[model samples]
Target: VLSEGEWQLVLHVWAKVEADVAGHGQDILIRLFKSHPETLEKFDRFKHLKTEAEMKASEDLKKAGVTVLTALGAILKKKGHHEAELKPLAQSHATKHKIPIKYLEFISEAIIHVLHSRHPGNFGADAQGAMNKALELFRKDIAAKYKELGYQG
Candidate 1:
């Protein structure tokens, strides 16, 4: 889904913000919740934050964001080399969290939002398209695990 040139851009952009992944992740969640407020219901802790500012200051949100960004960083570093690495995460979200796979799908848009917000001048259409392609590949592999449990949602 992503060409080598696009892959380089993905790595380059990810590298630029990976150092503050926790903050970036928080920004991503804030954007997601802002655009899709109903999605907050999926997170029992985050739902109580009330506002984007509150959520940004939430410790739980911070940690969650760090974990997500860290895993994503690893995936990006390997360029989907370890596809099975995300299996347990998908399983946990599907069975334990009881969060539908559909909600996970929206994260791609959230990532794009954060990227644009953080690096508006740098994140042009080509970069955005490349990021989407990279995210879709990750989603496909992760979603496959969810599908295995008959939880396509």
Candidate 2:
């Protein structure tokens, strides 16, 4: 659980990061894909891109990145209040995309790295801790729902 002050810190840093979701979000996605190239296989449309630049320049990736980041901004604002809102996303990934839970872990790490890299001075230890807890809460909730859908791996 985050204190009110810690929550404020997370929100402040997230506000700056989400300001350019198209750019920052694309950067985060690229970081994830570059670090775990196999993750790219999950997206058939982007799997053939063959390079980080190609993935980053993809309009589909850019739009999807922006949309997810916008939704994440809302999730941060509510502090897990919108957790159940992620059901469809979890279901789609589990049933359709067949994305493994580890990839979700990769995304969580990428989010922290992107925020910290973007705001080196502003994102301090307390903010990192708070964000970590918030994301853990999200991951746990989504994973549980994913399991409930009878799609285990």
Candidate 3:
């Protein structure tokens, strides 16, 4: 099991990828939407979002993996920390469904490759801290939820 701080660190890494995709042109982030068109949920930050260079590279992946990765990354990017998001899906499997923190790390690595491939120097310094801050914002929601559920954070 991961320590709480390490878990939040993983989320920080994931948030960095999403933020970079939004502010910059990272291919996989672009591809993620193409692979899963339905993944485009309403984000208050985006407005009249037109296609950019990142979405184009999505055409590079195999068609099958495109859909798979699209749905996977979309949901993960969107509602990853919410236990409710996974609850029904887990119940469908008829077994225990713990949060997939390890897979988050794996996906984070793939996203890092995309970011590094695009903006090399941007990943240093402020980027990492920015990610941590973003992760904290999201994870704080989870911690708040835990408290609401009668558990101490």
Best by lDDT: 2
- Rank the models by lDDT, top first: 2, 1, 3
lDDT (Cα, tens digit) per residue for candidate 2, span 18-118: 66879988988998888888888888777887788798779999997898788778777987677567878788878988977788889889888988888
TM-score to native of every candidate shown: 0.89, 0.91, 0.31
Query: lDDT per prediction?
Result: 0.81, 0.82, 0.43
Compared with the true structure, model 3 gives a TM-score of 0.31
lDDT of 1 at 49: 75
Instruction: Write candidate 3's Cα lDDT for 1-153 as tens digits.
Output: 234554455445455545533333345545444444433342233323456543443433334344434444444444345455433433322223232333333334445556556555555545544444444444445445544544443
Best-to-worst order by TM-score is 2, 1, 3
- Comparing candidate 1 with candidate 3, which one achieves the higher TM-score? 1
Better of 1 and 3 by lDDT: 1
Deviation (Å) of 107 in candidate 2: 0.7
In Å, residue 72's CA in model 3 sits off its true spot by 6.0
